[PDB]
Design a protein around this motif. Structure first.
Motif, PDB file in Angstrom:
ATOM      1  N   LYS A 297       7.584  10.431   2.532  1.00 47.60           N
ATOM      2  CA  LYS A 297       6.379  10.975   3.147  1.00 47.60           C
ATOM      3  C   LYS A 297       5.804  10.039   4.214  1.00 47.60           C
ATOM      4  O   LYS A 297       5.578  10.479   5.344  1.00 47.60           O
TER       5      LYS A 297
ATOM      6  N   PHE B 278      -7.569  10.000   9.917  1.00 49.67           N
ATOM      7  CA  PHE B 278      -8.272  10.917   9.032  1.00 49.67           C
ATOM      8  C   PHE B 278      -9.580  11.406   9.644  1.00 49.67           C
ATOM      9  O   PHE B 278     -10.279  10.661  10.330  1.00 49.67           O
TER      10      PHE B 278
ATOM     11  N   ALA C 147      -3.175   0.505   4.959  1.00 50.48           N
ATOM     12  CA  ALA C 147      -2.660   1.744   4.390  1.00 50.48           C
ATOM     13  C   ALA C 147      -1.424   1.389   3.550  1.00 50.48           C
ATOM     14  O   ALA C 147      -1.572   0.778   2.481  1.00 50.48           O
ATOM     15  N   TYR C 148      -0.232   1.736   4.042  1.00 44.92           N
ATOM     16  CA  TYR C 148       0.997   1.601   3.265  1.00 44.92           C
ATOM     17  C   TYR C 148       1.898   0.461   3.741  1.00 44.92           C
ATOM     18  O   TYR C 148       2.975   0.245   3.165  1.00 44.92           O
TER      19      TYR C 148
ATOM     20  N   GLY D 115      -5.803  14.450   6.876  1.00 49.03           N
ATOM     21  CA  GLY D 115      -5.120  13.232   7.254  1.00 49.03           C
ATOM     22  C   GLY D 115      -3.775  13.546   7.907  1.00 49.03           C
ATOM     23  O   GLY D 115      -3.099  14.519   7.545  1.00 49.03           O
TER      24      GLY D 115
ATOM     25  N   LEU E 231      -2.261   5.835  10.492  1.00 56.31           N
ATOM     26  CA  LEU E 231      -2.792   7.061   9.934  1.00 56.31           C
ATOM     27  C   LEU E 231      -4.108   7.425  10.622  1.00 56.31           C
ATOM     28  O   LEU E 231      -4.863   6.580  11.083  1.00 56.31           O
TER      29      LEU E 231
ATOM     30  N   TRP F 270      -9.747   3.351   3.152  1.00 56.84           N
ATOM     31  CA  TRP F 270     -10.737   4.282   2.617  1.00 56.84           C
ATOM     32  C   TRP F 270     -11.851   3.574   1.839  1.00 56.84           C
ATOM     33  O   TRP F 270     -13.022   3.947   1.968  1.00 56.84           O
TER      34      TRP F 270
ATOM     35  N   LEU G  19      -0.170  11.480   9.916  1.00 57.75           N
ATOM     36  CA  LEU G  19       0.449  10.328  10.548  1.00 57.75           C
ATOM     37  C   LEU G  19       0.041  10.386  12.015  1.00 57.75           C
ATOM     38  O   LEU G  19       0.004  11.475  12.585  1.00 57.75           O
TER      39      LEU G  19
ATOM     40  N   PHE H 143     -12.258  16.037  -3.306  1.00 56.44           N
ATOM     41  CA  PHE H 143     -11.442  14.931  -3.690  1.00 56.44           C
ATOM     42  C   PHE H 143     -12.425  13.911  -4.241  1.00 56.44           C
ATOM     43  O   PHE H 143     -13.422  13.717  -3.590  1.00 56.44           O
ATOM     44  N   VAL H 144     -12.128  13.313  -5.399  1.00 53.06           N
ATOM     45  CA  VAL H 144     -13.092  12.428  -6.032  1.00 53.06           C
ATOM     46  C   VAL H 144     -12.410  11.102  -6.337  1.00 53.06           C
ATOM     47  O   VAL H 144     -11.274  11.032  -6.788  1.00 53.06           O
TER      48      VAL H 144
ATOM     49  N   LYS I  12       2.582  16.540  10.633  1.00 52.65           N
ATOM     50  CA  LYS I  12       2.408  16.817   9.212  1.00 52.65           C
ATOM     51  C   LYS I  12       0.994  16.438   8.771  1.00 52.65           C
ATOM     52  O   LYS I  12       0.582  15.280   8.917  1.00 52.65           O
TER      53      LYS I  12
ATOM     54  N   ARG J 219      -6.805  21.965  -1.811  1.00 55.95           N
ATOM     55  CA  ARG J 219      -7.269  21.909  -3.191  1.00 55.95           C
ATOM     56  C   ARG J 219      -8.333  22.996  -3.376  1.00 55.95           C
ATOM     57  O   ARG J 219      -8.584  23.439  -4.493  1.00 55.95           O
TER      58      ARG J 219
ATOM     59  N   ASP K   6      -2.197  16.592   5.800  1.00 53.37           N
ATOM     60  CA  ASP K   6      -2.644  16.796   4.447  1.00 53.37           C
ATOM     61  C   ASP K   6      -4.139  17.096   4.476  1.00 53.37           C
ATOM     62  O   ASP K   6      -4.848  16.464   5.218  1.00 53.37           O
TER      63      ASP K   6
HETATM   64  C1  LIG Z   1      -4.880   0.795  -3.997  1.00 53.85           C
HETATM   65  O1  LIG Z   1      -3.797   1.348  -3.220  1.00 53.85           O
HETATM   66  C2  LIG Z   1      -3.369   2.619  -3.430  1.00 53.85           C
HETATM   67  C3  LIG Z   1      -4.013   3.534  -4.256  1.00 53.85           C
HETATM   68  C4  LIG Z   1      -3.538   4.842  -4.376  1.00 53.85           C
HETATM   69  C5  LIG Z   1      -2.371   5.245  -3.703  1.00 53.85           C
HETATM   70  C6  LIG Z   1      -1.884   6.616  -3.806  1.00 53.85           C
HETATM   71  C7  LIG Z   1      -2.078   7.436  -2.514  1.00 53.85           C
HETATM   72  C8  LIG Z   1      -3.544   7.773  -2.267  1.00 53.85           C
HETATM   73  O2  LIG Z   1      -3.696   8.209  -0.859  1.00 53.85           O
HETATM   74  C9  LIG Z   1      -4.655   7.627  -0.121  1.00 53.85           C
HETATM   75  O3  LIG Z   1      -5.310   6.677  -0.555  1.00 53.85           O
HETATM   76  C10 LIG Z   1      -4.956   8.235   1.211  1.00 53.85           C
HETATM   77  C11 LIG Z   1      -6.464   8.337   1.361  1.00 53.85           C
HETATM   78  C12 LIG Z   1      -6.997   9.444   0.499  1.00 53.85           C
HETATM   79  C13 LIG Z   1      -6.408  10.784   0.776  1.00 53.85           C
HETATM   80  C14 LIG Z   1      -4.896  10.705   0.620  1.00 53.85           C
HETATM   81  N1  LIG Z   1      -4.349   9.573   1.394  1.00 53.85           N
HETATM   82  C15 LIG Z   1      -3.113   9.623   1.987  1.00 53.85           C
HETATM   83  O4  LIG Z   1      -2.620   8.631   2.490  1.00 53.85           O
HETATM   84  C16 LIG Z   1      -2.389  10.976   2.044  1.00 53.85           C
HETATM   85  C17 LIG Z   1      -1.716  11.206   0.743  1.00 53.85           C
HETATM   86  C18 LIG Z   1      -0.751  10.267   0.283  1.00 53.85           C
HETATM   87  C19 LIG Z   1      -0.156  10.518  -0.980  1.00 53.85           C
HETATM   88  O5  LIG Z   1       0.782   9.691  -1.536  1.00 53.85           O
HETATM   89  C20 LIG Z   1       1.183   8.602  -0.710  1.00 53.85           C
HETATM   90  C21 LIG Z   1      -0.440  11.683  -1.671  1.00 53.85           C
HETATM   91  O6  LIG Z   1       0.137  11.929  -2.958  1.00 53.85           O
HETATM   92  C22 LIG Z   1       1.419  12.508  -2.962  1.00 53.85           C
HETATM   93  C23 LIG Z   1      -1.383  12.597  -1.192  1.00 53.85           C
HETATM   94  O7  LIG Z   1      -1.605  13.679  -1.986  1.00 53.85           O
HETATM   95  C24 LIG Z   1      -2.741  14.522  -1.640  1.00 53.85           C
HETATM   96  C25 LIG Z   1      -1.979  12.365   0.032  1.00 53.85           C
HETATM   97  C26 LIG Z   1      -1.405  10.995   3.270  1.00 53.85           C
HETATM   98  C27 LIG Z   1      -0.536  12.230   3.277  1.00 53.85           C
HETATM   99  C28 LIG Z   1       0.345  12.324   4.498  1.00 53.85           C
HETATM  100  C29 LIG Z   1      -0.468  12.219   5.829  1.00 53.85           C
HETATM  101  C30 LIG Z   1      -1.333  10.936   5.831  1.00 53.85           C
HETATM  102  C31 LIG Z   1      -2.222  11.011   4.597  1.00 53.85           C
HETATM  103  C32 LIG Z   1      -4.113   8.848  -3.057  1.00 53.85           C
HETATM  104  C33 LIG Z   1      -3.585  10.174  -2.979  1.00 53.85           C
HETATM  105  C34 LIG Z   1      -4.179  11.187  -3.680  1.00 53.85           C
HETATM  106  C35 LIG Z   1      -5.333  10.997  -4.393  1.00 53.85           C
HETATM  107  C36 LIG Z   1      -5.876   9.726  -4.474  1.00 53.85           C
HETATM  108  O8  LIG Z   1      -7.019   9.398  -5.132  1.00 53.85           O
HETATM  109  C37 LIG Z   1      -7.775  10.411  -5.710  1.00 53.85           C
HETATM  110  C38 LIG Z   1      -7.075  10.974  -6.922  1.00 53.85           C
HETATM  111  O9  LIG Z   1      -6.143  10.280  -7.495  1.00 53.85           O
HETATM  112  O10 LIG Z   1      -7.440  12.090  -7.346  1.00 53.85           O
HETATM  113  C39 LIG Z   1      -5.284   8.689  -3.794  1.00 53.85           C
HETATM  114  C40 LIG Z   1      -1.759   4.288  -2.868  1.00 53.85           C
HETATM  115  C41 LIG Z   1      -2.294   2.991  -2.707  1.00 53.85           C
HETATM  116  O11 LIG Z   1      -1.784   1.956  -1.862  1.00 53.85           O
HETATM  117  C42 LIG Z   1      -0.760   2.361  -0.933  1.00 53.85           C
END
Ligand SMILES: COc1ccc(CC[C@@H](OC(=O)[C@@H]2CCCCN2C(=O)[C@H](c2cc(OC)c(OC)c(OC)c2)C2CCCCC2)c2cccc(OCC(=O)O)c2)cc1OC
Length: 128
Positions: free
Chosen positions: A109, A118, A100-101, A47, A116, A78, A49, A65-66, A54, A61, A56
Motif C-alpha cells: 500500500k 491529508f 509517516a512510514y 488521505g 502523504l 497526525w 499518496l 475515525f477515533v 489512490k 466508514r 483513503d
Molecule cells: C505509531 O505508528 C503507527 C501507528 C499505527 C499505524 C497503522 C496505520 C494507521 O494509519 C495512519 O496513522 C494514517 C493516519 C490516520 C488515517 C490513516 N492513515 C494512513 O496512513 C492511511 C491508512 C494506512 C493504513 O495502513 C498503513 C490503513 O490500514 C490498512 C488504513 O486503513 C484505513 C489507512 C493511508 C492509506 C493510503 C493513502 C495514504 C493514507 C492507522 C490506520 C487506521 C486506523 C488507525 O487508527 C485508528 C484505529 O485503529 O481505529 C491508524 C502505523 C504506525 O506507524 C507507521
C-alpha cells in the motif's frame, strides 16, 4: 492543487522545523481549545499518496475515525498535526516520510519514502 499550496504557503508545525509536516487551515474551527495528549479525538479525513491516484477516506466508514492523541495510535504526523486543530477545523497536511512510514513504507500500500497528503476535519475531542 492542494498539495502545492501547502508546500508554498503551509506552516511548518514540526518541533525540529524540518518541514516534515506542513499545514494549511482550510476552515477555521470554534473555540480556543486544541486536544491534549490522552484526549480521545474524532475526525473525518481523506488521505492520498503525493504521487498516486489512490485515496483513503473515513467517509467510506460513514463513521468517525477515533483515536487517543499522543499515544502512538497513528503516524507521528497526525499526533503532531491533529493536536494543533480546533473543534470544527478542517486542515490540509503534507507529510514527509520521516513523520509517516519512513524508508520501510507499509508495503504494498505505502511505498518506501512516501510523502502523504491529508484533508482532516476535527469533529470533537474529549478528555480521557
Ligand atoms: C505509531 O505508528 C503507527 C501507528 C499505527 C499505524 C497503522 C496505520 C494507521 O494509519 C495512519 O496513522 C494514517 C493516519 C490516520 C488515517 C490513516 N492513515 C494512513 O496512513 C492511511 C491508512 C494506512 C493504513 O495502513 C498503513 C490503513 O490500514 C490498512 C488504513 O486503513 C484505513 C489507512 C493511508 C492509506 C493510503 C493513502 C495514504 C493514507 C492507522 C490506520 C487506521 C486506523 C488507525 O487508527 C485508528 C484505529 O485503529 O481505529 C491508524 C502505523 C504506525 O506507524 C507507521
Amino acid at each position: 492543487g492542494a498539495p502545492a499550496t501547502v508546500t508554498e504557503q503551509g506552516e511548518d508545525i514540526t518541533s525540529k522545523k524540518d518541514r516534515g509536516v506542513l499545514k494549511i487551515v482550510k476552515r477555521v474551527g470554534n473555540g480556543e481549545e486544541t486536544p491534549l495528549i490522552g484526549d480521545k479525538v474524532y475526525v473525518h479525513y481523506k488521505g492520498a499518496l503525493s504521487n498516486g491516484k489512490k485515496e483513503d477516506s473515513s467517509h467510506d466508514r460513514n463513521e468517525p475515525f477515533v483515536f487517543s492523541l499522543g499515544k502512538g495510535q497513528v503516524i507521528k504526523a497526525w499526533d503532531i498535526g491533529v493536536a494543533t486543530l480546533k473543534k470544527g477545523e478542517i486542515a490540509h497536511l503534507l507529510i514527509k516520510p520521516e513523520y509517516a512510514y519512513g524508508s520501510a513504507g507499509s508495503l504494498p500500500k505505502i511505498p518506501s519514502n512516501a510523502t502523504l497528503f491529508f484533508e482532516i476535519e476535527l469533529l470533537d475531542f474529549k478528555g480521557e
